């Protein structure tokens, strides 16, 4: 379509060597839209774990999203880091079935607390009919549900924004975490999810997480591939 740079027809896909190292170049179709969310969960939650100093830099490796922007992703050579990545992969695989409502990184002072001192949450929306109509409370939903899929390049922009905001939030905005804490991954199944379906690594629970009444809330950003949407949020005592 742009003949000032190419005689070939334009394709809704990302032409970048660095991007392809971590993410699918096409995200418009249902499977690759879902594959993108899986990679997004892995990348963003890796960034959060590292940037908040929840796990030391030994558990991570240096990656790039663009030539200008780098991040720390969990390393598959380290066994404990690998076990966490599998957690994240299992939760990500549940977006293919369409069963995952929210996955949150939950920080508490004592192990087992239902009330957190810091939460990084990623809430999902599933679309049908060409990825246009949302399937069906929360403040983000009304807006994000109406949000259109605007191409691969827009998704890359949204991903770059999220990682920059995370690195900026954790470094320049949030206070350091207390000397003692328990970090946890907790998720919420959708209503469509069968009772026999369980995400590997996650034991069932009658408790999610609760917040303080005066805890602050900041939005990191959103993602809108072809057939899915995600909303990233942070509640924190350290704000």
């Amino acid at each position: 379509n742009n003949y000032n740079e190419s005689l070939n027809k334009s394709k809704d896909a990302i032409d970048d060597k660095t991007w392809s190292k971590l993410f699918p170049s096409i995200v418009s179709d249902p499977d690759r839209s879902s594959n993108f969310m899986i990679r997004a969960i892995y990348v963003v939650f890796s960034a959060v774990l590292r940037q908040r100093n929840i796990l030391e830099k030994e558990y991570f490796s240096k990656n790039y999203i663009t030539e200008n922007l780098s991040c720390m992703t969990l390393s598959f050579k380290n066994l404990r880091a690998h076990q966490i990545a599998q957690l994240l992969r299992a939760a990500g695989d549940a977006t293919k079935d369409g069963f995952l409502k929210e996955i949150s990184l939950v920080v508490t002072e004592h192990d087992g607390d239902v009330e957190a001192i810091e939460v990084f949450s990623m809430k999902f929306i599933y679309f049908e009919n060409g990825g246009v109509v949302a399937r069906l409370e929360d403040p983000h939903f009304a807006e994000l549900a109406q949000l259109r899929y605007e191409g691969a390049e827009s998704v890359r922009d949204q991903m770059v924004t999220i990682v920059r905001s995370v690195q900026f939030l954790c470094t320049k905005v949030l206070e350091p975490l207390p000397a003692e804490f328990t970090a946890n991954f907790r998720l919420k199944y959708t209503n469509d999810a069968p009772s026999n379906f369980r995400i590997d690594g996650f034991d069932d629970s009658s408790t999610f997480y609760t917040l303080p009444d005066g805890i602050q809330s900041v939005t990191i950003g959103h993602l809108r591939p072809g057939h899915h949407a995600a909303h990233m949020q942070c509640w924190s005592k350290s704000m």
Partner: peptide, 13 residues
């Protein structure tokens, strides 16, 4: 209604 909690967790002492 239904929730899931990771079996492995991260502690700092």
């Amino acid at each position: 209604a239904r929730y899931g909690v990771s079996n492995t967790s991260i502690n700092r002492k």
